[PDB]
Design a protein around this motif. Structure first.
Motif, PDB file in Angstrom:
ATOM      1  N   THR A 129       1.627  -4.739   2.768  1.00 26.56           N
ATOM      2  CA  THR A 129       0.302  -5.225   3.112  1.00 26.56           C
ATOM      3  C   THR A 129       0.218  -6.743   3.150  1.00 26.56           C
ATOM      4  OG1 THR A 129      -0.875  -3.253   2.337  1.00 26.56           O
ATOM      5  CG2 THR A 129      -2.090  -5.288   2.354  1.00 26.56           C
ATOM      6  N   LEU A 164       0.804   0.847   9.007  1.00 25.80           N
ATOM      7  CA  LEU A 164      -0.557   0.653   8.515  1.00 25.80           C
ATOM      8  C   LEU A 164      -1.580   1.197   9.500  1.00 25.80           C
ATOM      9  CD1 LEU A 164      -2.232  -1.075   6.204  1.00 25.80           C
ATOM     10  CD2 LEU A 164      -2.462  -2.669   8.098  1.00 25.80           C
ATOM     11  N   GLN A 210       0.843  -1.188   0.000  1.00 25.17           N
ATOM     12  CA  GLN A 210       0.000   0.000   0.000  1.00 25.17           C
ATOM     13  C   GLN A 210       0.876   1.235   0.000  1.00 25.17           C
ATOM     14  OE1 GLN A 210      -3.663   2.107   2.416  1.00 25.17           O
ATOM     15  NE2 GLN A 210      -1.938   1.217   3.534  1.00 25.17           N
TER      16      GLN A 210
END
Lengths: 49, 26, 267
Positions: free
Chosen positions: C188, C211, C176
């Motif tokens: 990811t 994240l 990502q």
């Protein structure tokens, strides 16, 4: 392109006009000439000419 | 010696077509 | 991509017989005054219009389209254009000379999908993610089912941040991005280290932390409770984001009043 009918004229104008002297008096130390300048009509003479 | 002299809001040679002396052409 | 072809060629007739006829508004006394050469070279046009040959134009209306999406590079539209012209200058006919016309008056109109392509990033954001979510484990993790709320916050993030948020599949591991700049590239396929804490109450490598910090803004009462870590952290990351906004405006204010200075008693 030049400009047309609006700056010039098709009627018979003249470009160089003689003006033969009207009257010429005189003296010893001098000179008198009297023309009768005629600027016609609808013509426009500039004195510098 | 003095000059002044008039005629100066620019010039025309209007468009839709352009200027005089020719640029190039005897 | 057409008027750029119109505004690269084709210097009307209504506008010509609207001026010679003197039917304009601003300066009706315009065409009358021109030299009697022009007025006889514009009257025989809106009295018997001269035909045209449009091929080039709309062909140039196709090249300016390709090179704006991305085929034929900017520097090759001098070989592509000649090649297209010569092909369409061979097989031409009302056949092709029309098949163009449709292509040129559809490619500039069928650009909505392209617009959509960049308005929900449904090119590399949701098609990629809704592919990666299909590479995840089964959707029944052992510990908790706060899983789904997180995995949905991910889709919402990718769908509501068109900036770039591209989802590559840079080989076995889909990663990502947070922006075309890419200075927050988080892996990811490396949050199969969150299929651990999905349900509890220092094992997170910052990549996972990255994240969490990346999506947190888009989480509310979703990932929820005191679902351990994953719960709080998300809440604490949101709290830190709010405090970071506060400190950002504070630092701009304190540097507009006036050197480390503010950076010390802000951080």
């Amino acid at each position: 392109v030049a400009p047309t009918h609006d700056v010039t004229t098709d009627r018979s104008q003249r470009l160089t006009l003689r003006f033969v002297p009207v009257d010429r008096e005189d003296t010893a130390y001098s000179y008198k000439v009297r023309f009768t300048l005629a600027v016609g009509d609808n013509r426009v003479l500039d004195m510098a000419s | 010696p003095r000059h002044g002299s008039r005629p100066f809001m620019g010039t025309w040679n209007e468009i839709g077509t352009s200027q005089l002396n020719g640029g190039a052409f005897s | 991509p057409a008027m750029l072809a119109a505004l690269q060629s084709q210097p009307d007739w209504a506008a010509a017989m609207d001026r010679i006829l003197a039917l304009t508004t601003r300066n009706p006394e315009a065409f009358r005054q021109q030299p009697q050469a022009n007025r006889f070279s514009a009257i025989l046009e809106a009295v018997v219009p001269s035909r045209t040959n449009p091929t080039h134009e709309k062909v140039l209306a196709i090249v300016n389209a390709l090179t704006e999406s991305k085929a034929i590079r900017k520097d090759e539209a001098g070989l592509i254009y000649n090649a297209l012209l010569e092909r369409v200058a061979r097989y031409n006919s009302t056949n092709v000379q029309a098949n163009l016309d449709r292509l040129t008056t559809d490619v500039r109109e069928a650009v909505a999908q392209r617009e959509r392509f960049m308005h929900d990033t449904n090119l590399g954001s949701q098609v990629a993610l809704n592919a990666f979510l299909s590479t995840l484990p089964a959707n029944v993790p052992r510990g908790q089912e706060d899983y789904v709320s997180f995995i949905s916050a991910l889709r919402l993030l990718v769908a509501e941040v068109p900036q770039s948020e591209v989802y590559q599949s840079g080989p076995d591991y889909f990663f990502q991005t947070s922006r075309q700049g890419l200075q927050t590239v988080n892996l990811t396929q490396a949050f199969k280290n969150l299929q651990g804490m999905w349900g509890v109450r220092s094992l997170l490598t910052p990549n996972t932390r990255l994240l969490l910090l990346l999506i947190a803004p888009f989480t509310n009462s979703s990932t929820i409770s005191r679902d351990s870590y994953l719960g709080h952290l998300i809440t604490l990351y949101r709290e830190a984001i709010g405090q970071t906004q506060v400190d950002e405006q504070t630092f701009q204010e304190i540097t507009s009043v006036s050197d480390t200075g503010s950076l010390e008693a802000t951080l």
